[PDB]
Amino acid sequence: LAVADFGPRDTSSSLCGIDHEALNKQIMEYKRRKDGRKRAKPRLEQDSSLKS
Amino acid sequence: LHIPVMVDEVVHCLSPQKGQIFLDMTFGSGGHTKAILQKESDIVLYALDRDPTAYALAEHLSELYPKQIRAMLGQFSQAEALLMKAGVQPGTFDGVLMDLGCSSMQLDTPERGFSLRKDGPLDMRMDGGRYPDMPTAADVVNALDQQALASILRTYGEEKHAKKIASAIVQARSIYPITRTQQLASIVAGAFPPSAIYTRKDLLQRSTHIATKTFQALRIFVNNELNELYTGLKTAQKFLRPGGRLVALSFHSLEDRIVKRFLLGISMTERFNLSVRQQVMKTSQLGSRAPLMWELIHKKVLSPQDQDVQDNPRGRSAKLRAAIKL
RNA sequence: AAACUCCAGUUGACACAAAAUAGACUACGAAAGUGGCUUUAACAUAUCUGAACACACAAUAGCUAAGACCCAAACUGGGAUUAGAUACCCCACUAUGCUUAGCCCUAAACCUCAACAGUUAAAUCAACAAAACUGCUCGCCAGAACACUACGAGCCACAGCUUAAAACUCAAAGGACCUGGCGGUGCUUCAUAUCCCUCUAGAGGAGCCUGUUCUGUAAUCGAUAAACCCCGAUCAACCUCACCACCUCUUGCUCAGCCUAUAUACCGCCAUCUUCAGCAAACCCUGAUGAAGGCUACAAAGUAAGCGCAAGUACCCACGUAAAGACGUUAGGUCAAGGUGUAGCCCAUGAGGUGGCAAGAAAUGGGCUACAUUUUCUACCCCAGAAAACUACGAUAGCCCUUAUGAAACUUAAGGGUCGAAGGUGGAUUUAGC
Numbered sequence: 056l057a058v059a060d061f062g063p064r065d066t067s068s069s070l071c072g073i074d075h076e077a078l079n080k081q082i083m084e085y086k087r088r089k090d091g092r093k094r095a096k097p098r099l100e101q102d103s104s105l106k107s
Numbered sequence: 108l109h110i111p112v113m114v115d116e117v118v119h120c121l122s123p124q125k126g127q128i129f130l131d132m133t134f135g136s137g138g139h140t141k142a143i144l145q146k147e148s149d150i151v152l153y154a155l156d157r158d159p160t161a162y163a164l165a166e167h168l169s170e171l172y173p174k175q176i177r178a179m180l181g182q183f184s185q186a187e188a189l190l191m192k193a194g195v196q197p198g199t200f201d202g203v204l205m206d207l208g209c210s211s212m213q214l215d216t217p218e219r220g221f222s223l224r225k226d227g228p229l230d231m232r233m234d235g236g237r238y239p240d241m242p243t244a245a246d247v248v249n250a251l252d253q254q255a256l257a258s259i260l261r262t263y264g265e266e267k268h269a270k271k272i273a274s275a276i277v278q279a280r281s282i283y284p285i286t287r288t289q290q291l292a293s294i295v296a297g298a299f300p301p302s303a304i305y306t307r308k309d310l311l312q313r314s315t316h317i318a319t320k321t322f323q324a325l326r327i328f329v330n331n332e333l334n335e336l337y338t339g340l341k342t343a344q345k346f347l348r349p350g351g352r353l354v355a356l357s358f359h360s361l362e363d364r365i366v367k368r369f370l371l372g373i374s375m376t377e378r379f380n381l382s383v384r385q386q387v388m389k390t391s392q393l394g395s396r397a398p399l400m401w402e403l404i405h406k407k408v409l410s411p412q413d414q415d416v417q418d419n420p421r422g423r424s425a426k427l428r429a430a431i432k433l
Numbered sequence: 434a435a436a437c438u439c440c441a442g443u444u445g446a447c448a449c450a451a452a453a454u455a456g457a458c459u460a461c462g463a464a465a466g467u468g469g470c471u472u473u474a475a476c477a478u479a480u481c482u483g484a485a486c487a488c489a490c491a492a493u494a495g496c497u498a499a500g501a502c503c504c505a506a507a508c509u510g511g512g513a514u515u516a517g518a519u520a521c522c523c524c525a526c527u528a529u530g531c532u533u534a535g536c537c538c539u540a541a542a543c544c545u546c547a548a549c550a551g552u553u554a555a556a557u558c559a560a561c562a563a564a565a566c567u568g569c570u571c572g573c574c575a576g577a578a579c580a581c582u583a584c585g586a587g588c589c590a591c592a593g594c595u596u597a598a599a600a601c602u603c604a605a606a607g608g609a610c611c612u613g614g615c616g617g618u619g620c621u622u623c624a625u626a627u628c629c630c631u632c633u634a635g636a637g638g639a640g641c642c643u644g645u646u647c648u649g650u651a652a653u654c655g656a657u658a659a660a661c662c663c664c665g666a667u668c669a670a671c672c673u674c675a676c677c678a679c680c681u682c683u684u685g686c687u688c689a690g691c692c693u694a695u696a697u698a699c700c701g702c703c704a705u706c707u708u709c710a711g712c713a714a715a716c717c718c719u720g721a722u723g724a725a726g727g728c729u730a731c732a733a734a735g736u737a738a739g740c741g742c743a744a745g746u747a748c749c750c751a752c753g754u755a756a757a758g759a760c761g762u763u764a765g766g767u768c769a770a771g772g773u774g775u776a777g778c779c780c781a782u783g784a785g786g787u788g789g790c791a792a793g794a795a796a797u798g799g800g801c802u803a804c805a806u807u808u809u810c811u812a813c814c815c816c817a818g819a820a821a822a823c824u825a826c827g828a829u830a831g832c833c834c835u836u837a838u839g840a841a842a843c844u845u846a847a848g849g850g851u852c853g854a855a856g857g858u859g860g861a862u863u864u865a866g867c
């Protein structure tokens with residue numbers, strides 16, 4: 056940096072956190088278009104090998 | 108009736124005096140604008156609003172004072188161009204009063220669609236048809252996907268149940284169009300057990316509907332209040348005189364942060380609610396702020412008097428941040 | 434920032450506070466505790482065991498009273514961070530930590546190991562901890578939770594301590610260990626056309642071509658994150674055709690037929706990790722024959738075979754490129770290649786004829802051609818002459834007319850004429866290549 060020659064010496068998308076532009080582009084397209092269960096315990100699973 | 112929020116503080120704060128020109132970027136009902144034209148009879152004032160109904164009020168109220176009040180219509184971003192047409196590019200405005208939020212008239216009139224309690228078209232748009240192509244809240248909910256709509260609620264509504272409240276909206280829209288305020292409120296309630304409708308509480312500790320965070324979220328994405336607030340403050344600074352007192356009013360945290368991080372230079376991409384412990388950890392990693400352009404008249408955010416809160420609960424969260432340009 | 438500025442540095446004077454190094458020692462004491470120096474007093478018992486309550490003690494915190502006050506510090510005030518409040522950080526300061534005299538009687542008061550005596554041979558032993566036990570005595574325990582709770586009782590305790598239930602409720606609760614998953618988990622080394630930077634040409638902007646989506650239409654279907662999107666199609670004007678409208682046939686080209694539902698019943702053929710190196714058997718051995726584990730090359734329990742990789746083969750080599758690439762993963766794709774299980778239609782969900790749809794408000798993927806001077810046109814195939822900005826570059830688009838194919842062409846393709854538009858090298862982002 057001492058040897059070097061320097062010559063003669065004299066957006067909002069992140070702000071909100073959402074892609075507000077992309078969100079309003081999808082809405083414009085839409086506007087144009089229109090205008091639990093039980094699970095058995097594995098150990099208790101029943102087998103018929105002995106009956107066969 | 109709605110008394111202007113913190114009118115006594117905002118008047119003292121700006122100390123309107125003869126020979127001073129002031130701007131108002133949110134005329135709305137005009138209660139604050141009129142309280143400012145009462146203390147100083149020789150004051151010069153400029154008004155602005157996004158609602159043509161609000162701009163008509165100012166025009167009708169211009170009869171009371173022919174030139175002391177000048178009415179203008181447009182958004183914060185469009186304000187500089189509108190005022191640039193007048194030719195006051197330097198502006199030398201002694202004070203810019205940037206009141207924020209939804210007008211009392213806007214949300215008291217059910218037709219405007221801002222009130223979930225009443226039944227009106229799901230507009231929720233401060234614009235009064237000045238741009239008839241501007242999407243309304245009904246359009247936002249019927250078009251965006253769960254991931255997209257959930258982000259609107261999460262980022263702008265501070266809503267924990269963004270995926271749960273967004274899925275209900277996606278299912279409801281398919282069955283029928285979402286076009287009315289109560290129709291949406293019921294859909295959001297249907298995402299939770301029936302008792303959830305009033306489980307949540309406000310900071311006032313009074314029960315609120317379980318969709319009060321989806322009406323605020325859409326209100327801010329339809330009207331892009333947050334992004335328009337950053338440009339609005341920036342434009343005020345350019346048009347604000349040196350030594351001129353700015354006064355903002357933030358009713359919710361997201362807008363309050365921007366005003367705080369703008370009057371103090373803090374980067375808008377920093378982490379929120381940073382503790383002293385986290386601040387030390389952040390900078391320890393790098394080890395391996397620019398000069399302020401403001402002088403905060405009152406260092407800490409003011410708030411409405413507790414007695415006044417009960418009289419006007421709508422304004423309970425009004426955080427006043429005053430500053431002088433440097 | 435606030436605070437301080439009778440502040441800070443040197444030097445001297447100067448404690449009712451706390452006790453570097455020694456201490457890498459493992460001592461004293463019943464435990465709690467006890468680590469600056471000196472002195473005095475002084476550390477029960479010649480069998481052991483023996484208490485929630487008797488007797489005497491008992492860290493820290495706390496109470497009452499009187500003192501001390503360097504420093505520390507709940508609390509509090511101020512500053513800062515914060516959307517804001519509290520906390521975390523900074524400053525100041527208090528109860529408190531100290532002394533004295535009384536209380537209070539708690540601890541993860543834990544070596545989480547009761548006292549005493551004895552043994553090291555048996556079985557070493559559920560596991561882990563801390564090798565396994567015997568005699569003897571006291572204390573204590575009997576599913577979880579309710580419950581360090583309620584009531585009673587006692588207590589200098591008064592938001593307290595000690596002792597300590599029941600009802601309702603449940604089919605577990607719990608201890609140890611193994612595996613997996615996960616960690617805002619540690620360290621280490623990594624990706625070689627790659628995770629990032631670096632290299633070259635692109636996509637994302639324009640027009641056009643083409644797929645998809647959406648919308649439209651009386652008018653198919655399937656694919657549709659990676660792993661769909663010039664995909665089934667190495668291809669739709671009729672046909673193809675499975676679609677729509679109308680009309681027609683009924684043992685029907687078939688010892689009928691069905692492109693009817695189900696790819697979440699399948700075969701068949703494949704995508705994907707795979708730009709992987711592992712998979713599945715037969716044995717053997719260790720752990721007390723527990724869930725589990727099985728390597729050391731101067732080798733310590735692993736091994737004889739199968740599949741994949743590898744090898745070999747194809748292409749121009751032994752290089753490279755192809756091809757190959759197991760098991761398993763995504764109930765991934767395909768019942769509409771064909772076949773087929775199951776369910777359904779049989780005057781109809783089958784068969785045939787006629788005509789017709791196959792568009793664009795748009796959005797988006799891929800491609801093509803461009804935006805030009807390393808270019809444009811011509812000759813030539815590299816020693817040329819012109820062109821070169823509103824008559825330049827630029828449409829494979831539009832319109833018009835011919836020709837080719839066909840029975841049928843505003844429609845498909847080729848050619849000519851006319852026309853001369855956007856585009857002036859393209860934000861975030863993104864593709865490919867050793």
Ligand SMILES: Nc1ncnc2c1ncn2[C@@H]1O[C@H](CSCC[C@H](N)C(=O)O)[C@@H](O)[C@H]1O
Binds near residue numbers: 208210335
């Ligand atoms: N981006 C924007 N530009 C201009 N006006 C806006 C705006 N966002 C909101 N506003 C308007 O500003 C006002 C804020 S609420 C009303 C406050 C007003 N001072 C009164 O008289 O009560 C509303 O009228 C609202 O429509």
Ligand SMILES: [K+]
Binds near residue numbers: 452469
């Ligand atoms: K010492």
Ligand SMILES: [K+]
Binds near residue numbers: 456
């Ligand atoms: K020591």
Ligand SMILES: [K+]
Binds near residue numbers: 543
């Ligand atoms: K312990």
Ligand SMILES: [K+]
């Ligand atoms: K593990």
Ligand SMILES: [K+]
Binds near residue numbers: 636
């Ligand atoms: K491009």
Ligand SMILES: [K+]
């Ligand atoms: K299959």
Ligand SMILES: [K+]
Binds near residue numbers: 768
């Ligand atoms: K089939």
Ligand SMILES: [K+]
Binds near residue numbers: 768
């Ligand atoms: K079938």
Ligand SMILES: [K+]
């Ligand atoms: K393209």
Ligand SMILES: [Mg+2]
């Ligand atoms: Mg200072």
Ligand SMILES: [Mg+2]
Binds near residue numbers: 483
């Ligand atoms: Mg004894």
Ligand SMILES: [Mg+2]
Binds near residue numbers: 484
């Ligand atoms: Mg007893």
Ligand SMILES: [Mg+2]
Binds near residue numbers: 484
């Ligand atoms: Mg005892």
Ligand SMILES: [Mg+2]
Binds near residue numbers: 485
């Ligand atoms: Mg006790």
Ligand SMILES: [Mg+2]
Binds near residue numbers: 491
């Ligand atoms: Mg004690």
